[PDB]
Design a protein around this ligand. Structure first.
Ligand code: LQV
Ligand code: ZN
Length: 140
């Protein structure tokens, strides 16, 4: 589990979104495994605006933060999970690092702030749904 709290927005894995998230929907995209809902309070997260390929991610199944190199956001074929058949998971970044299904929601961060959240994890290893293209997260 995990979310990004930026301004009055909550960014979660679409497959972990709650009823309250869907009842307060701002934007969702199945292809990206992302959903954004509204919050009453303002959030303490700075989204990165950058093309970094190095950062650190939180891995709940290790209680550890790991430094990683990651690929730029792309349309990877992702192998079937419980929540998606496979499709081309878009805006996905892959690193070499451990992950399990429950690790979805761990922040990846660079020197500029939050890059994305764990979403996928194949043999390739850990995939992070990028949020850095979502400029609108910073305004209104
Ligand atoms: C971070 C992450 C996300 C998903 C997965 N696992 C899968 O997609 C499938 C489900 C059944 C066995 O593997 N592993 C890691
Ligand atoms: Zn950066």
């Amino acid at each position: 589990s995990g979310a990004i709290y930026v301004g009055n927005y909550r960014v979660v894995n679409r497959h972990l979104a709650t009823h309250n998230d869907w009842a307060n929907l701002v934007w969702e995209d199945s292809s990206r495994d992302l959903l954004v809902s509204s919050t009453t309070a303002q959030g303490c997260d700075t989204i990165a605006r950058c093309d970094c390929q190095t950062g650190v991610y939180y891995c709940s199944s290790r209680r550890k933060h790991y430094p990683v190199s990651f690929s730029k956001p792309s349309l990877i074929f992702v192998e079937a999970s419980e929540y998606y058949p496979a499709r081309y998971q878009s805006h996905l970044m892959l690193a070499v690092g451990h992950s399990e299904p429950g690790d979805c929601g761990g922040i990846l961060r660079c020197q500029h702030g939050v890059v994305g959240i764990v979403s996928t994890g194949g043999n390739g290893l850990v995939g992070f749904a990028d949020v850095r293209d979502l400029l609108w997260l910073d305004e209104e």
